[PDB]
Design a protein around this ligand. Structure first.
Ligand SMILES: Nc1ncnc2c1ncn2[C@H]1C[C@H](O)[C@@H](COP(=O)(O)OP(=O)(O)OP(=O)(O)O)O1
Ligand SMILES: Nc1ncnc2c1ncn2[C@H]1C[C@H](O)[C@@H](COP(=O)(O)OP(=O)(O)OP(=O)(O)O)O1
Ligand SMILES: [Mg+2]
Ligand SMILES: [Mg+2]
Lengths: 193, 194
């Protein structure tokens, strides 16, 4: 049983994974957030940090894969293949031009994807406004520094990623507008088969 | 016979590779310099472009690998493992701070170094900084004139350091690149015939 929890910032991926990790007793794998040296920088000045951030995060994914692909029972807060979503966002908001985005996608497919799977990818589908409010009460204060446009563009691209599903994830969709209690009940049900 | 030609900017790698090819028939694999959209930008403003530049370059290297893999005879103008030299330079010259440097190499080790070409000979064209700067002026690229001498000094230092440390254990063959071209080709052909 290899589980992943998928969705934008403030979707409640951490709250959901923790509860699951309590109920089934598996280990949660979490990307560096407190340890990321570019975190505050990233939200003050996207244009200047996007590349630094991206290279750091891609290194971290590469490490997680090393340990994960020899374990039967795992829970993943985010998957390894979701970094281009944040790039695509900066591209849409004109922090990254065509050339950069072409270099990155050329980079991603020809350098990164040379590393080359879950049982279920839970998608916490949520509106922008709700995620924004969960950043206010559950997320990192740095995340409070950029405008709404960023979060809108992120949510948009997350759904886009889910609809195109280019890696063929065994997706399962949960309406995250519901309170956590219900979300857990629907997740535990689906997992029981 | 897989040949790689190794040295700092203006060592005369292109001249030497062209001569060898002329005698032997082997294909030369240049790096993208002309089709590189960051080239002028990079020399105009290092700080803002080093990461963009680096990402492009490793991407290019990986393509060259994935087209020269199966070829019996190759001549490489530079190997795929020399990009960290350029990053180290910018680190000494305070274009990149300690973290960015660590991020770059942490990525290089975990992603790039995990993977393959085996050169029979890596020909180090060893030059003084002064000879290099003049060759940049003679037959180099016009954009390479845009930064101060101190860049080329550090780059030559790091190139010498790379050879002395020989981390990847290349089969190095040193050539005195101060010598005229004709003589360099004599030394190289003689070695190649073994
Ligand atoms: N590739 C990337 N580029 C830029 N920022 C990133 C990237 N990956 C992650 N981040 C940032 C955005 C968020 O602030 C944080 C990622 O974690 P996030 O999506 O918030 O999950 P989370 O574990 O906090 O659960 P949730 O927020 O769903 O409760 O780090
Ligand atoms: N990783 C990199 N980072 C920054 N600049 C780079 C990188 N790789 C290549 N370059 C730049 C520096 C130089 O301007 C040019 C490299 O070509 P160069 O060293 O001049 O070889 P060359 O084929 O012209 O032979 P030579 O100059 O020795 O005759 O591209
Ligand atoms: Mg969060
Ligand atoms: Mg040159």
């Amino acid at each position: 049983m290899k589980i992943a929890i998928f969705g934008t910032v403030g979707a409640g991926k951490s709250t959901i994974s923790a509860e699951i990790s309590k109920k089934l007793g598996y280990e949660i794998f979490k990307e560096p957030v407190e340890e990321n040296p570019y975190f505050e920088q990233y939200y003050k000045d996207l244009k200047k940090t996007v590349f630094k951030m991206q290279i750091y995060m891609l290194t971290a994914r590469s490490k997680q894969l090393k340990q994960a692909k020899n374990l039967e029972n795992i829970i993943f807060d985010r998957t390894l293949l979701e970094d281009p979503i944040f790039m695509k966002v900066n591209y849409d908001l004109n922090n990254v031009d065509q050339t950069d985005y072409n270099t990155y996608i050329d980079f991603y497919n020809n350098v990164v994807l040379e590393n080359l799977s879950f049982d279920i990818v839970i998608y916490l589908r949520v509106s922008t406004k709700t995620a924004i409010s969960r950043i206010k009460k559950r997320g990192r204060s740095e995340e409070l520094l950029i405008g709404e446009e960023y979060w809108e563009t992120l949510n948009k691209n997350y759904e886009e990623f889910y609809k195109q599903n280019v890696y063929d994830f065994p997706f399962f969709v949960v309406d995250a507008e519901l309170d956590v209690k219900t979300q857990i009940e629907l997740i535990m049900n689906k997992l029981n088969s």
